[PDB]
């Protein structure tokens, strides 16, 4: 069935000034990532810390640990590093994990590492809508991975940043089934992947909980001319109402 519930806005800045613009426009979650290391590339402990310091205590600070290989120990340590640096919401890009079992094994360890620091901290299992292009775990099993590993959020994003969006890799129907499945497990659902303002009603209709933006919040959109503008964030925030 159709939905018309509020969606939380997650904005991905690369520095402190970008984050201040995201905060001023009304973003709910300030996401610390590093596109240079991939789709969900990890930033540095000092950048997470600087962004936490600047971000009001009522907003969440999010941090990616990377487009991860199947290395549970390394990724559990990296999640501790992100949590200790001030992240409340930790994203794991399920890139090098090839199946359900490898993904659940890695995620169970990240959940333990994070919840041992603070039980209130959020663990996000992120899959790639275009996983076939990088050989990543099937995006369609991400709600079951999140469910079985004890995560809080089932998420999708795009691995290759070539201008192709979430909607170029997954149908509205399959995305609706992904959202419903995550919800039936008691999980929240976050969607990203070069999301444009025109995609927001489609995402609201299918009952997405969280929407992630970078390009749509940038004045140019592209890596060269694009800088996060508060007015663009305000526009997005209004479409999420």
């Amino acid at each position: 069935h159709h939905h018309h519930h509020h969606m939380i806005l997650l904005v991905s800045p690369i520095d402190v000034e970008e984050a201040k613009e995201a905060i001023a426009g009304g973003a709910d979650i300030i996401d610390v990532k590093n596109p240079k290391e991939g789709s969900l590339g990890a930033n540095f402990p000092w950048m997470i810390k600087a962004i936490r310091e600047v971000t009001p205590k009522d907003l969440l600070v999010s941090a990616t640990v990377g487009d991860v290989p199947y290395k549970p120990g390394t990724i559990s340590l990296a999640a501790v590093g992100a949590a200790i640096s001030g992240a409340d919401y930790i994203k794991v890009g399920l890139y090098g994990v090839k199946n359900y079992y490898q993904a659940v094994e890695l995620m169970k360890n990240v959940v333990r590492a994070v919840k041992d620091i603070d039980e209130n901290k959020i663990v996000v299992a992120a899959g790639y809508a275009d996983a076939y292009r990088v050989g990543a775990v099937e995006p369609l099993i991400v709600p079951k991975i999140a469910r079985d590993a004890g995560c809080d959020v089932a998420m999708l994003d795009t691995a290759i940043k070539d201008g192709k969006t979430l909607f170029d890799f997954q149908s509205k129907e399959i995305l609706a089934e992904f959202v419903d499945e995550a919800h039936s497990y008691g999980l929240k659902c976050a969607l990203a992947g070069s999301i444009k303002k025109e995609h927001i009603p489609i995402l609201k209709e299918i009952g997405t909980d969280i929407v992630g933006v970078r390009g749509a919040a940038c004045k140019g959109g592209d890596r060269n001319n694009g800088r996060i503008d508060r007015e663009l964030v305000k526009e997005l925030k209004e479409l999420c109402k």
Copy 2:
């Protein structure tokens, strides 16, 4: 250099709390928390590093690996914070996915900053593979320059593939001696590992190695996977390192 007697620090690598207790009882100087299931320098879990630190006497050091790392400075910096916060005094980075000098220095500079920002007294180890060519890892011979230029404390070598072939099957005594001298001229300490057997100890002592790393030689059956760390074997090794 060629030393007639040379004291070496003994590093033993356990996988759990009971193995760590055996390495402590045998007289190991450094207790190295690793996970062979994830590779040569595979990372263990934050809770395991903490449990081993808790059981290790305060006069001894706890070492931990962050993995056979890809070129991901952000991820590895975060992992180094995780290892340091969990109780490691000595943080080891396996330079596996890094392909050249520049990638290795860039990654290591960030790990050094991440670790020193927690505690300036914590040690950062840049580890290369003696058999790097077999896995496409950065040339082992440039590891002293990487450690020097990234601000690390230790230049190290180990083997990537655990097929029974040792450090000495990949590097000559002469080249290993030049590696030790080069590390020392940069004000760095030198650690050597790679299926090191008790017979290798006099050779490593001669070349001036500061730290010797073992797992297999300290394991009951001899096998580093099938067998478990035995205090008696650690004791025999500790005597040879004196």
Copy 3:
């Protein structure tokens, strides 16, 4: 109750499976892979020798992502006498590629005879060969209009269905297929000891080769009627 599927490689092996009480006679060629295709003449020879009350199954291969070729091969298997047409989802990498290929196979088969069965088969150990995730096979079968959602093993190294999938996940796969109105078939070096577990989880069809072969050896041994008689009793 569970249906027993036995996989022979020739006419004498098919006769041995029939005599033992196998419900479905599956024509495959292990030389071409896990679900390797046999020849049109072999499918016809086996159909001819199989009693009319029993079903003849045939694999089209461990298929690449080539909808046209596989649709033509499915026509070839159906025309040769196959009742059940099995597709090994090997070269297909995701949900969309698998649904696209399967939709075309379903159309090709149903255009010949609407009563013929289409089986979407995934690999329990897909990660070892880079095949489509086995856990999405019930959704693929549902969306392509197939009749059976199936799992088997891609690499025949002695590792079984149970070495790659937990009883819990296998039970969820069966329930999911059933909720879509599909039948469920399970294989992958299945031994006699696995039969009560597969029965418990509600599997409709169990597929065997090795367990039906004399020296246990699927690659050096041959189908024996006594072994097929024992598996049939265990299936009841």
Copy 4:
């Protein structure tokens, strides 16, 4: 004299080739590769629309080394209405693999109708895709019992048959096929200017798509009857 083969992708394109005077109507699917297979229903629809005095050709694909699957696909193409059955020797790496696959396709096709033609097709640019050496295709066709030895290009980047094979080597290929009692078919972005050269060397069948398409573009353009009329005149 040279026989003109035109490759349409649908019923309207086939009608355009027929109206222009094409001798052989070749059903292929460029989306699946150079000799990608179309669907059983498309081969049937094209056969239905083609006058009985003209031949219908169909590709089974840029095939992997899977004799069973390709034999079944060859049955599917033959049953669907194909008179000429074309096999793209892509995944086969040597003489032995190619002969083994082709022998099985020949048996599958001749078992349906002894009058149906089997075409062993190699790639003039095989080195680019790691396919079997094109120069041994006449011996493969001879030893597998095929009727036609053929060449085409695997990668459709604008490079032609003549960019990969010399006139001299192509003439030797034609002579070799003829000495084995085989017919020879040549394709690979063939343009109208290539027709006198192919005629000189003694080629029996010339295969076109691009030259028959409006914007020259095979991937954006469609078969035009006027272009097929011009190629037919040049073939006389």
Copy 5:
């Protein structure tokens, strides 16, 4: 048709003593190769020279330039190096060359380099009976490559030294056609590939011109226990009569 003509015996030694044993048994061609660098691995200029010095002037000294990549310039220079070092008969292993055109291009340059030094020196185009295992040029087109490049000999050998022979990769019929084809071009034919004494009558029957042996001339046969024995060479030489 069947044949019963004399076949020339080519023996492959690794050092000067092995070559002295080959000479004493009656070998016709003393082949200088280096199995450490592959099937037709190249030995060193000094080893070729040492073997030439020891070999009577009426016997030919043969030398391989390697299991070659598609590098015409390097291989032409290496053929000059082998010819200048005392080789009269130069073998090129067509390993990295992928088709007819690459093979003819490389071979034409080797022929020019060698014939410019001495027109009487022999150029051998060698293909691999098991080429599919290494991705080498199709062995069946080697007579046409040799013909079009102006070589003197069309040859086959095995690329992988796992105990599988020439007869495990090519049928007697296809090998007979290869010999007949080379002969119809005015070329000589050389065959090798773990050739055992039992294979010699089959090779004589099909009219092979030259037979190459290493293992069959060694007392053990295997790399560890195998050293060329003059009695073994004498036995082979008698089967070649």
Copy 6:
């Protein structure tokens, strides 16, 4: 080291006799016979090396590449004999397929023996790739030690992939200066190339480079494939090297 003025030997790489005549007329010190069709340090033919030697004045040196070589010591030793016999005084080996120090030293030792056995006065150049990581070639930074241990005369760097990226896009001025100093401390000469432009000449002079290698900068259109060696461009370069 940092030199205020430093004379550099100018090496120009022609592909045929007419290009060689243009490089001679422009004042090139070394005439380098290469074949870009076979790679960065692709080998030309024995007859081309001979034809170029014949046309080159006796006071100038003729250089020739043996290729972007695989690890095949026998083949490369034979190729080095071929280049030397054909008229090259200066033999360049591209360390491409060699993966480590040991493979590189083993290959180079054999090339040195093959060349010196013909003429002890002939020069052996061990060439590494500044961008080795892009092709999986041996680490460029160990090339001075390879040249030292194999008994070569020159330690050299060039670029493997000709995509417009230069020596300076892969190696810092500082690391290049250390490479030159290291080569000099071993008694070796240093040659540097890799899409070197006229603007790079003062930098290479400053770091103490002995030989500078060019093709593109001496080519009429600027393009090293599309264009041809022009005497005027060689003359402008020769003046900057003075």
